[PDB]
Enzyme design. Structure first.
Site, short mmCIF file in Angstrom:
data_model
loop_
_atom_site.label_atom_id
_atom_site.label_comp_id
_atom_site.label_asym_id
_atom_site.label_seq_id
_atom_site.Cartn_x
_atom_site.Cartn_y
_atom_site.Cartn_z
CG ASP A 170 -0.23 0.20 2.54
OD1 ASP A 170 0.80 -0.48 2.74
OD2 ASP A 170 -0.70 1.01 3.36
CE1 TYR A 258 8.45 1.58 5.64
CE2 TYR A 258 7.16 1.50 3.62
CZ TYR A 258 7.23 1.40 5.00
OH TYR A 258 6.14 1.12 5.76
N1 LIG Z 1 -4.87 -2.29 5.68
C1 LIG Z 1 -4.15 -3.04 6.52
O1 LIG Z 1 -4.65 -3.96 7.17
C2 LIG Z 1 -2.67 -2.78 6.66
C3 LIG Z 1 -2.15 -1.48 6.56
C4 LIG Z 1 -0.78 -1.29 6.69
C5 LIG Z 1 0.04 -2.39 6.94
N2 LIG Z 1 -0.48 -3.63 7.05
C6 LIG Z 1 0.42 -4.78 7.30
O2 LIG Z 1 -0.35 -5.98 7.51
C7 LIG Z 1 0.12 -6.72 8.65
C8 LIG Z 1 -0.98 -6.80 9.72
O3 LIG Z 1 -1.04 -5.58 10.46
P1 LIG Z 1 -2.40 -4.97 11.11
O4 LIG Z 1 -2.04 -3.70 11.85
O5 LIG Z 1 -3.49 -4.95 10.07
O6 LIG Z 1 -2.79 -6.11 12.19
P2 LIG Z 1 -2.76 -5.93 13.80
O7 LIG Z 1 -1.34 -5.82 14.29
O8 LIG Z 1 -3.79 -4.88 14.18
O9 LIG Z 1 -3.28 -7.39 14.22
C9 LIG Z 1 -2.62 -8.55 13.73
C10 LIG Z 1 -3.48 -9.79 13.93
O10 LIG Z 1 -2.90 -10.90 13.22
C11 LIG Z 1 -3.01 -12.06 14.05
N3 LIG Z 1 -2.03 -13.13 13.72
C12 LIG Z 1 -0.72 -13.11 14.01
N4 LIG Z 1 -0.11 -14.26 13.61
C13 LIG Z 1 -1.05 -15.04 13.06
C14 LIG Z 1 -1.06 -16.38 12.43
N5 LIG Z 1 0.08 -17.09 12.33
N6 LIG Z 1 -2.25 -16.85 11.97
C15 LIG Z 1 -3.38 -16.12 12.07
N7 LIG Z 1 -3.43 -14.89 12.63
C16 LIG Z 1 -2.32 -14.30 13.14
C17 LIG Z 1 -2.81 -11.51 15.46
O11 LIG Z 1 -3.30 -12.41 16.46
C18 LIG Z 1 -3.60 -10.23 15.40
O12 LIG Z 1 -4.96 -10.49 15.78
C19 LIG Z 1 1.38 -6.00 9.12
O13 LIG Z 1 2.54 -6.65 8.62
C20 LIG Z 1 1.28 -4.60 8.55
O14 LIG Z 1 2.58 -4.05 8.28
C21 LIG Z 1 -1.80 -3.84 6.91
MN LIG Z 2 4.39 -2.56 2.49
#
Ligand SMILES: NC(=O)c1ccc[n+]([C@@H]2O[C@H](COP(=O)([O-])OP(=O)(O)OC[C@H]3O[C@@H](n4cnc5c(N)ncnc54)[C@H](O)[C@@H]3O)[C@@H](O)[C@H]2O)c1
Ligand SMILES: [Mn+2]
Length: 435
Positions: A170, A258
């Site tokens: 993203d 980054y």
């Molecule tokens: N739109 C988005 O969701 C978004 C935005 C920016 C970055 N990211 C990236 O996506 C990833 C998730 O971040 P977030 O802030 O959305 O989540 P978060 O940190 O709010 O929550 C993560 C969830 O994933 C679960 N989890 C961890 N290991 C697992 C496994 N092996 N199997 C199943 N579930 C598991 C945890 O228990 C937790 O409930 C990160 O690496 C982040 O950098 C996502």
């Molecule tokens: Mn990324």
């Protein structure tokens, strides 16, 4: 129009509600018959799920909904898996950020030794999801927008080369959104671009409107003074502003934000606080706020008890899913094996480059030869990422020391070894053992 079955891997995520709101706002282009949540942390997921359950019954009661910790129940009968897991969660992100900093190295979610550590934790977890999906829904596509994609994508390339996984980031979407505002266009979809790099490590080479007018001159003049801060949170503002100095290293291109961690690591360490890191901010704010608003929704039995809004950004996820689902050929930056796209760069490297997306997945576009500056930086970093996956695969302490030693963020092999020994200690319950 057909309806789709989706499973969100990482239901317990604080982004889950926003993404769900987004999906509900896109039922016109991506209709859903079923939405499932999966997570390995049941209690954490239950709070998110029960709150989303209320939201779904209000806006879309025809969508079949369920949450679970059982892989079979989660991955059976799905067309797409939206994977946004964070192995180790925020307590480990906190370690990733503070351990390097006690040795005078930047601590960050996906870059430097912190990112390397998060990558070492994430590989195992993602391989599990891929295996679950292939076992219970062989025809499903996994939309992996988890981080750190450069390390995880290299692992899956090597270990699940044929899996139907789409690696997307993203960061480029957000930057393009700011670019569009700077030049004064309606949105980023009014732009057609060329770009190359590794994930979280790339450059825009061509930026035009749909008719072909060059938008680069105006972007250069503006970014050279204010970075990606358009005429319209503190930590992000600084990153977007610092792109001013990063773009200065190659005036013909526009850089991924980054790159500040690799070109100005000194600046990052100086402006850091080893007592309070980004993880602490999120933990005391976004983490507590979403879970609070979710318990408020469950206890009141109404969505309006919470202040959860549509996650507008996350829209690109539906672009990718619809591209696959309706064979749209939409053009987007994905992480794919290079294999000639960047002709003078390693064939077996995972690169972030424009691709046309259809029902068969991506059809990458050629890039050509890249200059020495970018080639040097990418050759160093891709070596880092490949040594990490080597360390994971071969269970080698020595490969990971090499990896950390190679990073542009790390000042020396001695500091690299000290950081490594601390990361090993802190990640005892997530990393495989290193011999
Ligand atoms: N739109 C988005 O969701 C978004 C935005 C920016 C970055 N990211 C990236 O996506 C990833 C998730 O971040 P977030 O802030 O959305 O989540 P978060 O940190 O709010 O929550 C993560 C969830 O994933 C679960 N989890 C961890 N290991 C697992 C496994 N092996 N199997 C199943 N579930 C598991 C945890 O228990 C937790 O409930 C990160 O690496 C982040 O950098 C996502
Ligand atoms: Mn990324």
């Amino acid at each position: 129009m057909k309806k789709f079955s989706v499973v969100i891997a990482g239901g317990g995520s604080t982004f889950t509600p926003g993404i769900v709101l987004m999906l509900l706002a896109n039922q016109d282009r991506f209709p859903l018959r079923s939405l499932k949540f999966y997570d390995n942390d049941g209690a954490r997921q239950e709070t998110i799920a029960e709150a989303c359950k209320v939201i779904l019954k209000e806006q879309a009661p025809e969508i079949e909904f369920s949450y679970t910790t059982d892989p079979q129940a989660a991955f059976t009968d799905v067309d797409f898996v939206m994977a946004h897991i964070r192995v180790g969660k925020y307590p480990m992100r906190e370690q990733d950020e503070k351990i390097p900093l006690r040795h005078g190295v930047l601590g960050q979610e996906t870059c430097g030794p912190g990112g390397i550590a998060y990558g070492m934790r994430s590989i195992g977890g993602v391989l599990e999801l891929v295996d679950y999906m292939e076992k219970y829904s062989p025809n499903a596509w996994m939309l992996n927008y988890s981080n750190p994609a450069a390390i995880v994508a290299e692992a899956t390339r090597r270990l699940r080369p044929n899996a139907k996984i789409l690696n997307i980031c993203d960061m480029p979407i957000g930057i393009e959104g700011r670019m569009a505002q700077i030049v004064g266009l309606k949105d980023r979809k009014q732009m057609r671009v060329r770009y190359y790099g590794l994930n979280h490590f790339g450059w825009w080479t061509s930026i035009e409107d749909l008719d072909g007018n060059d938008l680069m001159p105006k972007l250069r003049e503006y970014v050279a003074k204010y970075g990606y801060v358009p005429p319209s949170e503190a930590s992000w503002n600084d990153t977007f502003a610092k792109a001013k100095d990063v773009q200065a290293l190659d005036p013909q291109t526009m850089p991924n934000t980054y790159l500040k961690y690799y070109l100005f690591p000194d600046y990052v360490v100086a402006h850091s606080n080893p007592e309070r890191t980004r993880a602490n901010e999120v933990m005391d704010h976004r983490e507590k706020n979403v879970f609070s608003a979710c318990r408020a929704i469950i206890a009141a039995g109404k969505s309006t008890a919470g202040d959860l809004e549509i996650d507008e950004h996350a829209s690109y996820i539906v672009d990718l899913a619809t591209a696959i689902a309706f064979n749209t050929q939409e053009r987007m930056l994905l992480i794919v094996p290079n294999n000639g796209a960047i002709h003078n760069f390693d064939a077996d490297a995972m690169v972030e480059i424009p691709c046309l997306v259809g029902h068969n997945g991506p059809e990458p576009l050629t890039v050509g030869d890249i200059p020495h500056f970018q080639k040097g930086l990418m050759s160093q970093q891709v070596a880092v990422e490949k040594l990490v996956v080597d360390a994971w695969e071969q269970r080698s302490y020595h490969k990971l020391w090499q990896a950390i030693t190679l990073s542009k963020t790390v000042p020396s092999a001695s500091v690299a070894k000290a950081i490594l020994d601390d990361l090993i200690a802190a990640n005892k319950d997530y990393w495989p053992e290193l011999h």
